[PDB]
Structures are given as structure tokens and as C-alpha cells.
């Protein structure tokens, strides 16, 4: 009988030998959770125009928030945009006058929710 025994030593030296990493597929233009080499977040990934230096991996803005990333599989730059959020307000006359209302979604495009696009947001229920 042929016998092989494997022993694992984990010491104060940096870890060197261990298992592979399983990657998924890359999807753009949608609000997803993401993990790039241990950098985790939530947002929408889009095509970018920034050009990193060949040793650089991440991109930060003035307030030190990550806004660009490089795909480790294919060395391409992707921009990271927060998923939409805002306030929801109800425009009404008095209940003494009517029960009709209109709704304003603040800082949200009308395609992601009588639909009228203002700079204040998207207005539904008004002519």
C-alpha cells in the first residue's frame, strides 16, 4: 500500500501556500454587491476613461472614497457609482378640498421608479 501524509505548518512567516480563488462573471450597469481582491462594496460599475499606472489598482477621490477599480482578470478600469437614493414627498391640497395627491421622488430619474421630469426630481400624478 502506498501512503502519503501531508502536514501543514502555519508559522509567523507570511502565508504562502493555499487554495484557489473562484471568480464569478462581471456585470455592468446594475446595482450589485462586488468584491475585487478583498475590496468589498455596493454600487453600479460602468466603463471608465481614467488611465491608471500599471502598478496601481484602486482609485480614490478628495474625501478618500473609492470610485474606480481595476479588474484583476482583464486589466480594465471601471467606475463605481452609488445606487440611487432620495426622499419621497406628497403634494396635496387640503383634505377639505380633495383626496387627489401627487408624488415627488427627489434626485431620481423618472425611468427608475403623468410622469414629469423636473430638476428637483420626478413628479408623478401632475399634469
Amino acid at each position: 500500500y502506498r501512503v502519503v501524509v501531508l502536514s501543514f505548518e502555519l508559522l509567523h512567516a507570511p502565508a504562502t501556500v493555499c487554495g484557489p480563488k473562484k471568480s464569478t462573471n462581471l456585470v455592468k450597469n446594475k446595482c450589485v454587491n462586488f468584491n475585487f481582491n478583498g475590496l468589498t462594496g455596493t454600487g453600479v460599475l460602468t466603463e471608465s476613461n481614467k488611465k491608471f499606472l500599471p502598478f496601481q489598482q484602486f482609485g480614490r477621490d478628495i474625501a478618500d472614497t473609492t470610485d474606480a477599480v481595476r479588474d484583476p482578470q482583464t486589466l480594465e478600469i471601471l467606475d463605481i457609482t452609488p445606487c440611487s437614493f432620495g426622499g419621497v414627498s406628497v403634494i396635496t391640497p387640503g383634505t377639505n378640498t380633495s383626496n387627489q395627491v401627487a408624488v415627488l421622488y427627489q434626485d431620481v430619474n423618472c425611468t427608475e421608479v403623468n410622469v414629469f421630469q423636473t430638476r428637483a426630481g420626478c413628479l408623478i400624478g401632475a399634469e
Binding site: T40, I62, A63, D64, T65
Partner: protein, 50 residues
């Protein structure tokens, strides 16, 4: 006026990466590396600071 408002807002945004005596300033890392009984204490420290 403009500069004072921008500076205050930047200070508020920057205060969000301090750990205030916890183990980490990232909620997701603490949640994924520790269990709720003690992640609760760490999260409470983060909440009081913020």
C-alpha cells in the same frame, strides 16, 4: 461662506473612517469576522462616535 460650508461637510464625511476605539471602522468587516455577541459592542462604539 462657501468655503466654511464645504470644509464642515468634508470634516463630517472624513470623521466616518475613524474607529473610535473599536477594532475596525468598517461595519462589514466586523460583521464578517466576529459574532453578534461582541460585534454588538464594537458596533455600539461606532454608533456613539458617529
Amino acid at each position: 461662506v462657501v468655503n466654511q460650508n464645504a470644509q464642515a461637510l468634508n470634516t463630517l464625511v472624513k470623521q466616518l473612517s475613524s474607529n473610535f476605539g473599536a477594532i475596525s471602522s468598517v461595519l462589514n468587516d466586523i460583521l464578517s469576522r466576529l459574532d453578534p455577541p461582541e460585534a454588538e459592542v464594537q458596533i455600539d462604539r461606532l454608533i456613539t462616535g458617529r
